[PDB]
Coordinates of C-alpha atoms and ligand atoms in Angstrom, one line a residue:
Chain A
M35 CA 73.8 -157.8 62.4
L36 CA 71.1 -156.1 64.6
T37 CA 69.4 -154.3 61.7
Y38 CA 67.0 -152.8 64.1
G39 CA 69.8 -151.4 66.2
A40 CA 70.0 -152.5 69.8
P41 CA 67.6 -152.3 72.7
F42 CA 66.3 -148.9 74.1
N43 CA 64.1 -147.6 76.9
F44 CA 60.5 -147.5 75.6
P45 CA 59.1 -144.9 78.0
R46 CA 61.8 -142.4 77.3
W47 CA 61.2 -142.8 73.6
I48 CA 57.5 -142.2 74.0
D49 CA 58.4 -139.1 76.0
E50 CA 60.7 -137.8 73.3
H51 CA 58.5 -138.4 70.3
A52 CA 55.5 -137.2 72.3
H53 CA 55.1 -134.4 69.7
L54 CA 54.9 -136.5 66.6
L55 CA 51.7 -138.2 67.7
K56 CA 49.3 -136.4 65.4
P57 CA 45.8 -136.9 63.6
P58 CA 44.0 -138.3 61.6
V59 CA 45.7 -141.6 62.4
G60 CA 48.0 -140.4 65.2
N61 CA 50.6 -143.2 64.5
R62 CA 54.4 -143.4 64.7
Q63 CA 56.2 -146.6 63.7
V64 CA 59.1 -147.6 65.9
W65 CA 61.2 -149.7 63.6
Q66 CA 61.2 -149.3 59.9
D67 CA 61.2 -151.9 57.0
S68 CA 60.5 -154.9 59.3
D69 CA 57.9 -157.6 59.4
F70 CA 56.4 -157.0 62.9
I71 CA 54.9 -153.6 62.7
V72 CA 55.4 -151.8 66.0
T73 CA 53.5 -148.5 65.9
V74 CA 52.7 -146.3 68.9
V75 CA 49.5 -144.3 68.5
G76 CA 48.6 -141.3 70.7
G77 CA 45.7 -139.0 71.1
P78 CA 43.6 -137.2 70.1
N79 CA 42.6 -139.2 67.0
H80 CA 39.9 -138.7 64.5
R81 CA 38.6 -142.0 63.2
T82 CA 35.1 -142.4 61.9
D83 CA 36.2 -145.4 59.8
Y84 CA 36.4 -149.1 60.3
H85 CA 39.6 -151.0 59.6
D86 CA 39.2 -154.6 58.3
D87 CA 42.7 -156.0 59.0
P88 CA 43.2 -159.4 57.4
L89 CA 45.6 -160.2 60.2
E90 CA 45.8 -160.1 64.0
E91 CA 46.5 -156.8 65.8
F92 CA 47.8 -156.5 69.3
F93 CA 47.5 -153.5 71.7
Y94 CA 48.8 -152.7 75.2
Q95 CA 47.6 -149.3 76.3
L96 CA 50.9 -148.3 77.8
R97 CA 49.7 -145.0 79.2
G98 CA 46.3 -143.4 78.9
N99 CA 42.8 -144.6 78.1
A100 CA 40.9 -145.4 74.8
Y101 CA 38.3 -147.6 73.2
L102 CA 37.3 -149.6 70.1
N103 CA 33.9 -149.6 68.4
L104 CA 33.4 -152.9 66.7
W105 CA 30.8 -155.2 65.1
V106 CA 30.1 -158.3 67.2
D107 CA 27.7 -160.4 65.0
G108 CA 26.6 -157.4 63.1
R109 CA 25.8 -155.3 66.2
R110 CA 27.7 -152.0 67.1
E111 CA 29.8 -152.5 70.1
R112 CA 32.7 -151.2 72.1
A113 CA 35.9 -152.6 73.7
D114 CA 37.5 -150.4 76.3
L115 CA 41.3 -149.9 76.3
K116 CA 41.7 -148.9 80.0
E117 CA 45.2 -148.1 80.7
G118 CA 47.5 -151.1 81.2
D119 CA 45.2 -153.5 79.4
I120 CA 46.3 -155.5 76.4
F121 CA 44.1 -157.3 73.9
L122 CA 44.4 -159.2 70.6
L123 CA 42.0 -158.5 67.8
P124 CA 41.1 -161.5 65.7
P125 CA 41.4 -161.2 61.9
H126 CA 38.9 -159.1 59.9
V127 CA 37.1 -158.0 63.0
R128 CA 36.1 -154.5 62.2
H129 CA 37.7 -151.9 64.4
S130 CA 37.3 -148.1 64.9
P131 CA 40.0 -146.9 67.3
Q132 CA 38.9 -144.0 69.4
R133 CA 41.8 -142.3 71.1
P134 CA 40.5 -139.1 72.8
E135 CA 42.8 -138.0 75.7
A136 CA 45.9 -136.1 74.6
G137 CA 49.1 -137.5 75.9
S138 CA 47.9 -141.1 75.3
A139 CA 50.1 -143.9 74.1
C140 CA 49.2 -147.4 73.0
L141 CA 51.5 -150.1 71.6
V142 CA 49.8 -151.3 68.5
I143 CA 51.5 -154.3 66.7
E144 CA 50.6 -155.9 63.5
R145 CA 52.4 -157.7 60.6
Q146 CA 53.3 -156.9 57.1
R147 CA 50.4 -158.0 54.9
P148 CA 51.9 -160.4 52.2
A149 CA 51.4 -159.6 48.6
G150 CA 47.9 -160.6 47.7
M151 CA 46.4 -159.8 51.2
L152 CA 44.4 -156.7 51.5
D153 CA 43.0 -154.6 54.4
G154 CA 39.6 -153.0 54.1
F155 CA 38.3 -149.7 55.3
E156 CA 34.5 -149.5 55.7
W157 CA 32.0 -146.9 56.7
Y158 CA 28.5 -147.6 58.0
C159 CA 25.3 -145.5 58.1
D160 CA 24.0 -143.9 61.3
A161 CA 20.4 -144.6 60.7
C162 CA 20.2 -147.9 58.9
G163 CA 23.6 -149.4 59.9
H164 CA 24.2 -150.6 56.3
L165 CA 27.7 -150.5 54.8
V166 CA 28.1 -147.1 53.3
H167 CA 31.4 -147.4 51.6
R168 CA 34.3 -149.8 51.6
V169 CA 37.8 -149.9 50.1
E170 CA 40.3 -152.7 49.9
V171 CA 44.1 -152.2 49.8
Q172 CA 47.6 -153.7 49.6
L173 CA 48.7 -151.8 52.7
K174 CA 52.3 -150.6 52.7
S175 CA 52.4 -147.9 55.5
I176 CA 50.1 -147.7 58.6
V177 CA 51.6 -144.3 59.1
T178 CA 52.0 -142.5 55.8
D179 CA 49.4 -144.1 53.5
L180 CA 46.0 -144.1 55.2
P181 CA 44.7 -140.5 55.4
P182 CA 44.9 -140.2 51.6
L183 CA 41.6 -142.2 51.3
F184 CA 39.8 -140.7 54.2
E185 CA 40.5 -137.5 52.4
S186 CA 38.8 -138.7 49.2
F187 CA 35.7 -140.0 51.0
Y188 CA 35.1 -137.1 53.4
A189 CA 35.3 -135.1 50.1
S190 CA 32.9 -137.2 48.1
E191 CA 29.2 -137.1 48.8
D192 CA 28.7 -139.9 46.2
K193 CA 30.6 -142.3 48.4
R194 CA 29.2 -141.2 51.8
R195 CA 25.8 -142.0 50.4
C196 CA 24.0 -144.8 52.1
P197 CA 23.0 -147.4 49.4
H198 CA 20.1 -148.5 51.6
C199 CA 18.5 -145.4 53.0
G200 CA 20.3 -142.5 51.3
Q201 CA 21.3 -140.6 54.5
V202 CA 24.7 -139.0 53.8
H203 CA 27.5 -139.8 56.2
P204 CA 28.9 -136.7 58.1
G205 CA 32.5 -137.5 57.1
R206 CA 35.5 -135.6 58.2
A207 CA 33.4 -134.5 61.1
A208 CA 31.1 -137.0 62.5
Chain B
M284 CA 33.4 -162.9 67.7
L285 CA 36.3 -161.9 70.0
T286 CA 37.8 -165.4 70.1
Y287 CA 40.5 -164.1 72.4
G288 CA 38.0 -162.8 74.8
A289 CA 38.0 -159.1 75.5
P290 CA 40.7 -156.7 76.9
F291 CA 42.2 -157.2 80.4
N292 CA 44.7 -155.5 82.6
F293 CA 48.1 -156.8 81.9
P294 CA 49.9 -156.0 85.1
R295 CA 47.3 -157.6 87.3
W296 CA 47.6 -160.8 85.1
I297 CA 51.3 -160.8 85.5
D298 CA 50.7 -160.5 89.3
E299 CA 48.3 -163.4 89.4
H300 CA 50.2 -165.9 87.3
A301 CA 53.4 -164.9 89.0
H302 CA 53.7 -168.4 90.2
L303 CA 53.5 -170.2 86.9
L304 CA 56.7 -168.6 85.6
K305 CA 59.1 -171.6 85.9
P306 CA 62.3 -173.0 84.4
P307 CA 63.9 -174.2 82.1
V308 CA 62.1 -171.9 79.7
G309 CA 60.1 -169.9 82.3
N310 CA 57.3 -169.1 79.7
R311 CA 53.6 -168.6 79.9
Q312 CA 51.6 -167.9 76.8
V313 CA 48.8 -165.3 77.1
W314 CA 46.4 -166.2 74.4
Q315 CA 46.1 -169.7 72.9
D316 CA 45.8 -171.1 69.4
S317 CA 46.5 -167.7 67.8
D318 CA 49.0 -166.4 65.2
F319 CA 50.7 -163.7 67.2
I320 CA 52.4 -165.5 70.0
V321 CA 52.2 -163.5 73.2
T322 CA 54.3 -165.2 75.9
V323 CA 55.4 -163.7 79.2
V324 CA 58.7 -165.1 80.5
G325 CA 59.9 -164.6 84.0
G326 CA 63.0 -165.5 86.0
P327 CA 65.1 -167.3 87.0
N328 CA 65.7 -169.1 83.7
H329 CA 68.2 -171.7 82.8
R330 CA 69.2 -171.4 79.2
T331 CA 72.6 -172.5 77.9
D332 CA 71.1 -172.9 74.4
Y333 CA 70.8 -170.6 71.3
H334 CA 67.5 -170.3 69.6
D335 CA 67.6 -169.8 65.8
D336 CA 64.1 -168.3 65.2
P337 CA 63.3 -168.0 61.5
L338 CA 61.1 -165.0 62.3
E339 CA 61.3 -161.8 64.2
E340 CA 60.9 -161.7 67.9
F341 CA 59.9 -158.7 70.0
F342 CA 60.4 -158.0 73.7
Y343 CA 59.5 -155.3 76.2
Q344 CA 61.0 -155.9 79.6
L345 CA 57.9 -154.9 81.4
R346 CA 59.3 -155.3 84.9
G347 CA 62.8 -156.5 85.9
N348 CA 66.2 -156.8 84.1
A349 CA 67.7 -159.4 81.8
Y350 CA 70.1 -160.0 78.9
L351 CA 70.8 -161.7 75.6
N352 CA 73.9 -163.4 74.5
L353 CA 74.1 -163.4 70.7
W354 CA 76.5 -163.9 67.8
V355 CA 77.2 -160.5 66.0
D356 CA 79.3 -161.6 62.9
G357 CA 80.4 -164.8 64.6
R358 CA 81.5 -163.1 67.8
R359 CA 79.9 -163.8 71.2
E360 CA 78.0 -160.7 72.4
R361 CA 75.3 -159.5 74.7
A362 CA 72.2 -157.3 74.5
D363 CA 71.0 -155.9 77.8
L364 CA 67.3 -155.9 78.5
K365 CA 67.2 -153.2 81.1
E366 CA 63.7 -152.7 82.5
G367 CA 61.4 -150.8 80.3
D368 CA 63.4 -151.4 77.1
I369 CA 62.0 -153.0 74.0
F370 CA 63.9 -154.5 71.1
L371 CA 63.2 -156.4 68.0
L372 CA 65.4 -159.4 67.1
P373 CA 66.0 -159.8 63.4
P374 CA 65.4 -163.3 61.9
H375 CA 67.8 -166.2 62.5
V376 CA 69.9 -164.1 64.8
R377 CA 71.0 -166.5 67.5
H378 CA 69.8 -165.7 71.0
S379 CA 70.4 -167.1 74.5
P380 CA 67.9 -165.4 76.8
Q381 CA 69.3 -165.0 80.3
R382 CA 66.6 -164.1 82.9
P383 CA 68.2 -164.2 86.4
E384 CA 66.2 -162.0 88.8
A385 CA 63.2 -163.7 90.2
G386 CA 60.0 -161.8 89.9
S387 CA 61.0 -160.7 86.4
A388 CA 58.6 -160.4 83.5
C389 CA 59.2 -159.7 79.8
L390 CA 56.7 -159.5 77.0
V391 CA 58.0 -161.8 74.3
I392 CA 56.1 -161.8 71.0
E393 CA 56.6 -164.0 68.0
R394 CA 54.5 -165.6 65.2
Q395 CA 53.4 -169.0 64.3
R396 CA 56.0 -170.6 62.1
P397 CA 54.2 -171.7 58.8
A398 CA 54.4 -175.3 57.9
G399 CA 57.9 -175.8 56.3
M400 CA 59.6 -173.2 58.5
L401 CA 61.8 -174.5 61.2
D402 CA 63.5 -173.0 64.2
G403 CA 66.9 -174.1 65.3
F404 CA 68.6 -174.7 68.7
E405 CA 72.3 -174.6 68.7
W406 CA 75.0 -175.1 71.3
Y407 CA 78.6 -173.8 71.0
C408 CA 81.9 -174.8 72.6
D409 CA 83.5 -172.8 75.4
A410 CA 87.1 -173.2 74.3
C411 CA 86.9 -173.3 70.5
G412 CA 83.6 -171.5 69.8
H413 CA 82.6 -174.1 67.2
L414 CA 79.0 -175.3 66.8
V415 CA 78.7 -178.2 69.2
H416 CA 75.2 -179.4 68.4
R417 CA 72.2 -178.1 66.5
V418 CA 68.6 -179.3 66.0
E419 CA 65.9 -178.0 63.7
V420 CA 62.2 -178.1 64.3
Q421 CA 58.6 -177.4 63.3
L422 CA 57.8 -175.5 66.4
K423 CA 54.3 -175.9 67.8
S424 CA 54.6 -174.7 71.5
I425 CA 57.1 -172.1 72.9
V426 CA 55.8 -173.2 76.2
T427 CA 55.3 -177.0 76.3
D428 CA 57.6 -178.4 73.7
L429 CA 61.1 -177.0 74.1
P430 CA 62.6 -178.6 77.3
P431 CA 62.1 -182.1 75.8
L432 CA 65.2 -181.6 73.6
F433 CA 67.4 -179.8 76.2
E434 CA 66.6 -182.9 78.2
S435 CA 68.0 -185.3 75.6
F436 CA 71.2 -183.2 75.0
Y437 CA 72.1 -182.5 78.6
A438 CA 71.8 -186.3 78.8
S439 CA 73.9 -187.2 75.8
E440 CA 77.7 -186.8 75.9
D441 CA 77.8 -187.8 72.2
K442 CA 76.0 -184.6 71.3
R443 CA 77.7 -182.3 73.8
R444 CA 81.0 -183.3 72.1
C445 CA 82.8 -180.5 70.3
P446 CA 83.4 -181.8 66.7
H447 CA 86.4 -179.4 66.5
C448 CA 88.3 -179.7 69.8
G449 CA 86.5 -182.5 71.7
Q450 CA 85.8 -180.6 74.9
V451 CA 82.4 -181.7 76.3
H452 CA 79.8 -179.1 76.9
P453 CA 78.7 -178.8 80.7
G454 CA 75.1 -179.2 79.8
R455 CA 72.2 -179.0 82.2
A456 CA 74.6 -177.0 84.3
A457 CA 76.9 -174.7 82.6
Ligands
3HA38 N1 43.7 -150.0 64.1 C1 44.8 -149.3 63.7 C2 45.4 -149.5 62.5 O1 44.9 -150.5 61.7 C3 46.5 -148.8 62.1 C4 47.1 -147.9 63.0 C5 46.5 -147.6 64.2 C6 45.4 -148.3 64.6 C7 44.8 -148.1 66.0 O2 44.0 -149.0 66.5 O3 45.0 -147.1 66.6
3HA39 N1 63.8 -166.6 72.9 C1 62.7 -167.2 73.5 C2 62.0 -168.1 72.7 O1 62.4 -168.4 71.5 C3 60.9 -168.7 73.3 C4 60.5 -168.4 74.6 C5 61.2 -167.5 75.3 C6 62.3 -166.8 74.7 C7 63.0 -165.7 75.6 O2 63.8 -164.9 75.0 O3 62.9 -165.7 76.8
FE40 FE1 43.7 -151.7 62.7
FE41 FE1 21.5 -145.6 56.1
FE42 FE1 63.7 -167.0 70.8
FE43 FE1 85.5 -176.7 71.3

């Protein structure tokens, strides 16, 4: 059958679940236990981390504006998600989704990482730009399974310690 | 780098390439040689066939209206893509995308079928509802590689011949 129910108006939906869009990831997955992972992220989000997805990621800023800090060749950068734009992120490209304006909604779509495929979550230093701390995982919930790490890094000086210059990363408040 | 270039306004795009949306599939792939397959299909389309995708398929009727004939348990049916709706098609569920109103645009997203994974394209009889003709393939272009079969079925009575009641399928004109 139509496991994922039948079709439904997307805007309305966004309008109804406008209140479930909350930090630190601001997510909200549309259909559960699928392969295509259709989440809808709103603002304001608090990300100071860099996701290292091993798969592609697609976005279409349905309503609102936002950006993406990223590493081009090894140089800090920034992609701008101006309302109405779409964009496909190649694999492993490091992304730091910045969603500031409340009432924002972006369609983020990814896949289910196979068993054996891990996503990474890095943190870089402000002064020296060296990798400060990275973690690899067998992702199983881009909604209810991310914050738990953030929470154990923003809480550990040992980790937020730059292995190149020693400057400690701000953490849970950049 | 950003292989798929950087972000861009999606509506504008749709507006520019409004003239490349043509039958019998009406497609138009957004980014080439990727994994996520972002096509944008417009109307009017001429489909009398049933796609048997081995993977999920997602749609968001950006602008316009359209529907999907499908087989529920083995009963002809119909999903309605009213503008603004989204919907995820489970795997193998047989679909017959009907896109009638010119100037229509739907965001259809699928994946790249691995090597060894084939999509099917069936045809059923009007009177007896039995499978009339089916073909399996290692898909490699939901834009420039489909019509070629349609063309060899609509042109072959032998195939359009119901193996249960004998009534010939209309073909290239239902
Ligand atoms: N990049 C993201 C991710 O990996 C999971 C959930 C949300 C995002 C995002 O870009 O907002
Ligand atoms: N179902 C489709 C497919 O398999 C390829 C291209 C377009 C469609 C569609 O639904 O329009
Ligand atoms: Fe990500
Ligand atoms: Fe440093
Ligand atoms: Fe299909
Ligand atoms: Fe028949």
